[PDB]
Amino acid sequence: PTGLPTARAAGCPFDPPPGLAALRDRAPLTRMEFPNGHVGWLATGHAVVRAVLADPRFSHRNDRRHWPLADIGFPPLPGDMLHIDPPDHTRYRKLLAGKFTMRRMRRLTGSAQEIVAGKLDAMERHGGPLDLLEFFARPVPTLMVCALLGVPLQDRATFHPPVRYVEMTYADMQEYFRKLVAAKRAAPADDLLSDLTTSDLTEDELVGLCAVMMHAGVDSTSNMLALGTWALLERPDQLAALRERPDLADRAVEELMRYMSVVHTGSRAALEDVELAGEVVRAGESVAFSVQAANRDPARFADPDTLDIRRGAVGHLGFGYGVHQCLGMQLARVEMRVAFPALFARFPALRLAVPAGDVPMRDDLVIPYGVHRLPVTW
Numbered sequence: 541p542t543g544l545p546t547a548r549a550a551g552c553p554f555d556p557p558p559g560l561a562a563l564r565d566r567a568p569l570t571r572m573e574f575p576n577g578h579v580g581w582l583a584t585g586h587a588v589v590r591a592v593l594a595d596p597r598f599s600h601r602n603d604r605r606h607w608p609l610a611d612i613g614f615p616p617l618p619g620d621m622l623h624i625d626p627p628d629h630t631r632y633r634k635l636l637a638g639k640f641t642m643r644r645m646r647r648l649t650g651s652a653q654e655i656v657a658g659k660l661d662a663m664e665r666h667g668g669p670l671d672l673l674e675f676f677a678r679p680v681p682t683l684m685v686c687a688l689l690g691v692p693l694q695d696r697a698t699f700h701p702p703v704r705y706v707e708m709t710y711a712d713m714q715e716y717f718r719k720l721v722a723a724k725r726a727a728p729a730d731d732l733l734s735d736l737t738t739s740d741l742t743e744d745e746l747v748g749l750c751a752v753m754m755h756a757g758v759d760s761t762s763n764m765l766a767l768g769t770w771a772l773l774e775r776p777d778q779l780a781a782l783r784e785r786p787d788l789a790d791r792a793v794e795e796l797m798r799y800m801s802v803v804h805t806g807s808r809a810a811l812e813d814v815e816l817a818g819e820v821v822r823a824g825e826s827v828a829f830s831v832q833a834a835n836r837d838p839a840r841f842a843d844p845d846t847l848d849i850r851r852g853a854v855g856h857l858g859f860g861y862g863v864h865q866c867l868g869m870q871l872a873r874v875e876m877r878v879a880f881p882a883l884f885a886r887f888p889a890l891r892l893a894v895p896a897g898d899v900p901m902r903d904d905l906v907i908p909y910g911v912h913r914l915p916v917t918w
């Protein structure tokens with residue numbers, strides 16, 4: 541009977557739309573009308589959302605679900621494993637999961653802390669004020685995906701706007717990665733893309749997969765680095781605790797993932813009738829889910845609307861859940877674990893260069909949430 545609330549509070553940009561807590565505490569699963577007229581369901585409770593994401597009877601195909609954020613299509617792009625179901629998804633997942641484990645991703649930790657070091661150096665020499673996104677938040681995960689895939693160092697400039705060129709199309713990236721894949725076959729190296737030439741993926745799938753990680757691996761990470769930096773500098777008591785015991789960095793990253801929930805909303809479709817939250821999801825119904833409302837669910841988190849890096853543990857749904865749970869989540873953890881304490885160790889008095897109310901937020905219906913830039917100075 542109700543639509544999806546998407547409007548934030550004007551001076552509370554880190555927090556979910558207020559209308560979600562009213563629908564959730566009324567009912568963690570409720571009826572929802574989608575932008576195209578589909579009468580479906582909205583899941584806001586943490587337990588209900590988690591059951592939605594883990595059940596094998598739910599589909600993420602774009603020809604099965606309805607998009608809850610706006611009215612709209614597309615073809616399942618080559619290398620898009622997120623909007624396909626098992627066993628098609630499973631083939632990607634087994635091929636890739638053992639390559640993204642936390643063991644193999646810590647083994648890029650030094651590369652991460654040198655990428656961060658290089659950009660922290662460029663920030664200082666340029667001087668403040670500057671845009672953190674252009675200078676740090678976007679470069680750092682861009683070069684991490686490059687270092688993960690074995691992009692040649694002389695080639696990385698083409699992939700992000702000059703720290704101070706026209707943004708490559710999704711077709712440009714493919715034509716480049718075709719060229720790069722062919723070079724990896726004749727000369728493999730110690731990187732993910734070299735290993736994957738000997739796999740079952742066609743040229744189309746693997747090339748498409750590379751172009752997806754260049755966007756999927758950057759956008760949400762960059763906005764986490766931006767929003768989390770913005771949140772940490774407002775809370776110098778949090779910074780002092782991270783400064784004192786720096787091993788709180790791991791807890792601090794998780795709590796920021798839970799607080800921000802940049803991938804704020806999604807939906808799945810019922811492949812079959814599924815009983816969920818005491819009530820039956822008809823087959824063919826879409827169940828939209830709010831990650832951000834589930835990460836502020838007081839059923840799961842005490843004082844959930846409070847940012848506190850001391851408690852930050854796992855259980856949040858910021859990386860998703862189930863079979864589609866973020867493949868790059870251990871890589872992203874290594875980046876933020878290195879980047880957040882490194883920023884403030886180098887710039888302890890880092891702070892916004894404009895009033896917080898002047899920070900340009902991304903549109904309510906965009907995925908992921910975040911900022912278009914973040915002027916900072918020190």
Ligand SMILES: COC(=O)[C@@H]1[C@H](O)[C@H](C)[C@H](O)[C@H](C)/C=C\C=C(/C)C(=O)Nc2c(C)c(OC(C)=O)c3c(c(OC)c(C)c(O)c3c2O)C(=O)/C(C)=C/[C@@](C)(O)[C@H](O)[C@@H](C)[C@H]1O
Pocket residue numbers: 602607609612617620622623752753755756759803905906907908
């Ligand atoms: C072109 O879409 C956009 O411009 C997005 C934007 O929100 C606009 C305003 C709008 O919503 C969109 C047009 C409308 C309907 C979208 C529908 C039905 C859909 O299927 N959604 C998507 C699509 C198409 C995705 O992309 C792939 C290839 O699967 C991804 C995705 C993710 O990373 C693993 C997600 C965590 C994720 O959740 C989604 C997602 O939900 C990616 O792999 C990449 C590469 C994502 C991205 C960096 O490119 C941006 O996040 C990107 C998705 C967004 O900027």
Ligand code: HEM
Pocket residue numbers: 600621622623629633685753756757758760761764802803806857858859860861863864865866867868869871872
């Ligand atoms: C803070 C950083 C990140 C966040 C918040 C994030 C968020 C997410 C979320 C929520 C999903 C699941 C969406 C759903 O279930 O509908 C997802 C899936 C995915 N992410 Fe990310 N992500 C991050 C970093 C990365 C990185 C760095 C990479 C690449 C190296 C990556 C690649 C992927 C892939 C491939 C999937 C699909 C996995 C599958 O379908 O099995 N992500 N991400």
